[PDB]
Amino acid sequence: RIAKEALTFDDVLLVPAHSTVLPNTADLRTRLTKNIALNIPMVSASMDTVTEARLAIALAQEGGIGFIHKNMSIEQQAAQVHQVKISGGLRVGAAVGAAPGNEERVKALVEAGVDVLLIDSSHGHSEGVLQRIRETRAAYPHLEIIGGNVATAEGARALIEAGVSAVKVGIGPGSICTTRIVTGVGVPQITAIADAAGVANEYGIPVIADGGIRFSGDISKAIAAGASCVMVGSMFAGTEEAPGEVILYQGRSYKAYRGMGSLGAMSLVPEGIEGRIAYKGHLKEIIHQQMGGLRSCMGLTGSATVEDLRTKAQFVRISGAGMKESHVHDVQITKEAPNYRL
């Protein structure tokens, strides 16, 4: 009944190794799905405070892909997909529910030229969800389909066998998620990525690490645990291109950020809250900061490619003291850096 210990980002560090890679020469290309490549390993969450066309365009220009959220009419969703397609033949994705009734939406989104369809659910291992993956595969046998979310070996296998092109991993880790507290269920994200990747590696199916990314080092750790890219919410929330107006509070600027299972979003119990995230300027500058840290990791681990980081890098386990030593400590900071701040 007690399966083992499980670990997340702040429980591990990566081991530096012999390297003939310099940061500016590391190759950040990776896979999102079996047949869709990315130039960087970053995708945006399908959240109404994160991804509509405007953010999807910016992110695609930088080499990632956005997933257009489903809190809008079918017509609006397809129009937003279309807009991204007609902006330079940029790749775009779109989410739909794992609930019956959604066939219309999927059709309109496929007709609109969507590159990758995401069946996002909080329980990718629900039979219901698997069934809707199977029917979607049968109806669209050449559509790249992302399923999840799962946190286990068996959950990944069940998704792969139902027909998905990629497995999405994460139950409960999101900055705004309260699932693990509200229900008591979830698995710490590093362990969850590795167990899922362990299985998915065998079908050549990529794993997307969704949730709980805060610092650029978490991106390196997620990928080294077996993920081919990461999906991020709070890190992109607050950018100029994210949906929503700037709000001024106590001398600062913010945009609204909320879980997709929060009361305001759902519009009988919520598994997310609503909050505010600091305004951060252009997404592009954030991506440069985040990829800067990753490139640097790849230099420190002698990882030439994302694949090298994903399959050959080592970790050590650390304690609470190890983590405090890792952050800045014993000094009063007077000038933060754009990749390290309150």
Ligand X SMILES: O=c1[nH]cnc2c1ncn2[C@@H]1O[C@H](COP(=O)(O)O)[C@@H](O)[C@H]1O
Annotated binding site for NAD(+): 120-123, 126, 170-172, 177, 296
Task: Please give the structure tokens belonging to residue 56.
Answer: 């999807």
Determine which helix (DSSP H) or strand (DSSP E) holds 231, and give its type and residue range: strand 229-232
Q: Is 206 within 8 Å of 43 (Cβ atoms)?
A: no
Q: Which does 232 bind (CB under 5 to 8 A by kind): ligand X, ligand NAJ, a second copy, none?
A: ligand X
Q: Is 230 within 8 Å of 213 (Cβ atoms)?
A: yes
Q: What does DSSP say about strands 116-119 and 144-150: parallel, antiparallel, or unpaired?
A: parallel
Applying the rule CB under 8 A, the residues between 54 and 113 that interact with a second copy are: none
Instruction: Count the neighbouring beta carbons within 10 Å of the beta carbon of residue 266.
Output: 14
Kindly list the residues in this chain that would bind ligand X in the complex (CB under 6 A): 45, 47, 149, 170, 174-177, 179, 210-213, 231-235, 259-262, 271-272
Cβ proximity to a second copy, 35 vs 183, nearer residue: 183
Cβ proximity to a second copy, 96 vs 256, nearer residue: 256
Annotated binding site for XMP: 175, 177-179, 210, 212, 233-234, 257, 260-261, 271
With CB under 8 A as the contact rule, the residue among 61, 134, 275, 307 that binds a second copy is: 275
With CB under 8 A as the contact rule, the residue among 46, 80, 175, 239 that binds a second copy is: 175
How far apart are alpha carbons 19 and 217 in whole angstroms?
18
DSSP letter, residue 244? S
Applying the rule CB under 5 A, the residues between 171 and 200 that interact with K ion are: 177
Cβ proximity to ligand NAJ, 240 vs 274, nearer residue: 274
- Give me the least distance between CB of 178 and K ion, in Å please: 6
- Measured in degrees and rounded to the nearest 5, phi and psi for residue 329 equal -155, 150
* Binding window for a second copy (CB under 8 A); candidates: 27-35, 87-95, 161-169, 171-179: 171-179
**Site size with a second copy, rule: CB under 8 A:** 132
Tell me if residue 193 falls in helix, strand or coil.
helix
Cβ proximity to ligand X, 47 vs 96, nearer residue: 47
Q: Which does 104 bind (CB under 5 to 8 A by kind): ligand X, a second copy, ligand NAJ, none?
A: none
- Measured in degrees and rounded to the nearest 5, phi and psi for residue 206 equal -70, 155
Neighbouring residues of 253: CB distance < 8 A, sequence distance ≥ 6: 246, 247, 278, 279
Q: Is 262 in the site for a second copy (CB under 8 A)?
A: yes
Residues 113-152, mask of contacts with a second copy (x by CB under 8 A): ---------xx-xxxx---------------------xxx
Q: What angle do CA 339, 260, 63 make, to 5 degrees?
A: 45
Cβ proximity to ligand NAJ, 30 vs 216, nearer residue: 216
Cβ proximity to ligand X, 115 vs 271, nearer residue: 271
CA 294 vs CA 24, 132, 184, 238: distances in Å = 10, 36, 33, 21
Dihedral (C-alpha) 109, 113, 116, 121: value to the nearest 10 degrees?
Answer: -10
Applying the rule CB under 8 A, the residues between 291 and 320 that interact with a second copy are: 292-294, 296-297, 299-302, 312-320
Neighbouring residues of 304: CB distance < 8 A, sequence distance ≥ 6: 21, 26, 27, 298
Q: Which does 47 bind (CB under 5 to 8 A by kind): a second copy, ligand X, K ion, none?
A: ligand X
| Residues with a known catalytic role | 177
Q: Is 52 in the site for a second copy (CB under 8 A)?
A: no
Nearest CA to 226 out of 193, 200, 199, 187 is that of 193
Q: Which does 231 bind (CB under 5 to 8 A by kind): ligand NAJ, a second copy, ligand X, none?
A: ligand X
Q: Is 216 in the site for a second copy (CB under 8 A)?
A: yes
